[PDB]
Amino acid sequence: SMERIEGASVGRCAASPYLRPLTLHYRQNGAQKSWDFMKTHDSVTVLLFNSSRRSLVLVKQFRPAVYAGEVERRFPGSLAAVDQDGPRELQPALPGSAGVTVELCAGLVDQPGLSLEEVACKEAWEECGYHLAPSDLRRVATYWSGVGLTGSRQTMFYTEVTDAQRSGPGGGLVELIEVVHLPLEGAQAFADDPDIPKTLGVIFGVSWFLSQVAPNLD
Amino acid sequence: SMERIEGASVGRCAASPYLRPLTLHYRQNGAQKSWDFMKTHDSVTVLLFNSSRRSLVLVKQFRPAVYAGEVERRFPGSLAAVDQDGPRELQPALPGSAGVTVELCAGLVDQPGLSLEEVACKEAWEECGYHLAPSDLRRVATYWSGVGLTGSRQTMFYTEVTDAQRSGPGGGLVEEGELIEVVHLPLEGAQAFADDPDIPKTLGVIFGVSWFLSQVAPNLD
Ligand SMILES: CC(C)Oc1ccc(-c2nn(C3CCN(C)CC3)c3ncnc(N)c23)cc1
Numbered sequence: 001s002m003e004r005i006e007g008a009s010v011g012r013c014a015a016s017p018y019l020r021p022l023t024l025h026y027r028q029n030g031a032q033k034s035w036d037f038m039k040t041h042d043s044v045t046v047l048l049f050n051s052s053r054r055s056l057v058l059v060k061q062f063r064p065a066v067y068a069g070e071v072e073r074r075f076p077g078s079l080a081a082v083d084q085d086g087p088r089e090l091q092p093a094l095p096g097s098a099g100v101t102v103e104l105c106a107g108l109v110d111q112p113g114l115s116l117e118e119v120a121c122k123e124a125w126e127e128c129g130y131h132l133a134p135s136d137l138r139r140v141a142t143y144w145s146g147v148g149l150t151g152s153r154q155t156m157f158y159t160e161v162t163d164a165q166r167s168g169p170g171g172g173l174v175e176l177i178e179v180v181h182l183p184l185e186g187a188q189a190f191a192d193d194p195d196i197p198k199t200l201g202v203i204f205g206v207s208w209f210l211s212q213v214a215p216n217l218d
Numbered sequence: 219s220m221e222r223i224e225g226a227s228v229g230r231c232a233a234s235p236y237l238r239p240l241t242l243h244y245r246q247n248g249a250q251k252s253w254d255f256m257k258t259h260d261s262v263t264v265l266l267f268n269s270s271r272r273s274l275v276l277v278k279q280f281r282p283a284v285y286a287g288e289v290e291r292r293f294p295g296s297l298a299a300v301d302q303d304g305p306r307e308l309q310p311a312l313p314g315s316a317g318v319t320v321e322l323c324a325g326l327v328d329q330p331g332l333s334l335e336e337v338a339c340k341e342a343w344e345e346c347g348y349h350l351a352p353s354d355l356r357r358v359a360t361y362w363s364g365v366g367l368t369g370s371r372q373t374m375f376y377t378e379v380t381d382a383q384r385s386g387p388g389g390g391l392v393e394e395g396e397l398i399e400v401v402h403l404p405l406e407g408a409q410a411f412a413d414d415p416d417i418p419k420t421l422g423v424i425f426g427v428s429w430f431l432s433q434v435a436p437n438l439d
Pocket residue numbers: 034035036037147148149236261324325326393394
């Protein structure tokens with residue numbers, strides 16, 4: 001989560017492996033309709049509870065999409081259509097902290113040879129520094145995210161760890177990610193504080209752990 | 219959520235008045251970087267608890283993007299790049315139920331002069347037929363939906379309603395041709411509804427049920 005961002009500029013977006021524009025044409029109950037959407041990948045998330053530190057493991061990082069959307073709120077029109085000349089430097093622009101979010105460890109399912117559990121284990125090592133095995137993972141929920149513009153499905157896993165599995169670092173492969181250990185005592189106040197940029201996966205992860213897992217511990 | 223879907227095809231979308239893909243170029247830790255994202259407005263959601271029926275109020279509708287993703291999920295390559303020879307008929311296709319989702323009532327922060335609570339009330343009227351008062355909405359949470367591809371912020375509201383407050387029809391706006399069905403989920407079987415993986419549900423529904431049962435339901439009796 002290196003909040004140090006410079007040279008922020010918005011340019012044209014032609015072709016991406018992550019954003020593929022498509023149109024579904026269809027008839028619903030006889031009525032001809034169309035819908036423009038983006039083909040994107042499914043994903044997985046994992047909530048880790050470190051029972052030694054009595055803390056939940058989260059990740060903090062810079063999200064360029066969040067930063068861009070935040071520049072638009074405080075300076076309307078900053079994200080207008082870019083001409084063919086080249087990327088337009090965002091002026092005025094916000095500090096990189098505007099794009100800094102707190103999330104669950106997450107990763108895309110964009111490699112055909114890895115299971116959902118294997119993607120979750122790979123991401124927990126690269127981002128959080130914890131050694132996980134697929135047999136240590138439990139499925140919490142599988143849901144659809146962004147039903148309006150994408151049909152992506154995200155699967156949330158839960159797992160319990162100690163420092164004995166933190167045999168190395170996260171922070172991406174080098175990617176700049178800061179690992180966050182949230183003590184259980186202040187976890188609910190963390191999730192409810194709008195001053196922190198959080199995802200729904202974090203709010204639900206914390207809420208689900210405290211209401212269903214924590215009362216059955218010890 | 220009429221599940222009769224026919225003629226499903228996928229077409230190239232070169233120019234879309236609804237899609238706004240952009241790329242952010244920036245400098246971080248001294249190493250030039252780029253990121254592909256979509257400019258989307260913010261949104262609101264509202265969870266309703268009908269005390270007269272002791273049921274949470276949800277919406278069910280056909281989501282074309284969800285349908286396409288499920289066809290692709292069962293038949294990879296269904297959404298391969300489309301050539302210039304018109305729309306490509308989806309063959310094989312799936313029954314329309316594969317795109318039918320259960321969601322919370324939700325709308326976009328696009329109408330000027332309307333606060334977040336108002337936009338939520340208008341969506342509850344247009345989609346669920348309930349007439350709400352904005353000052354009666356309790357703010358549950360505010361958060362960044364889809365941080366990887368969008369910078370949109372979503373705010374969730376909650377309020378209790380009665381049968382008498384359902385002073386409007388259902389369905390949404392017929393201007394877009396929307397076909398939205400209202401669902402009343404009984405309270406004693408709501409958690410099993412959110413855990414059963416055999417229904418296309420959003421995280422907002424799963425969190426909404428969980429939050430209601432642990433933060434609102436004990437204080438009712
Ligand atoms: C935020 C999200 C959960 O809700 C949405 C998002 C987009 C559309 C949409 N609405 N529309 C209309 C616009 C104008 N009306 C008259 C016809 C079609 C689209 N068209 C192409 N792609 C589309 N994703 C849409 C609807 C609901």
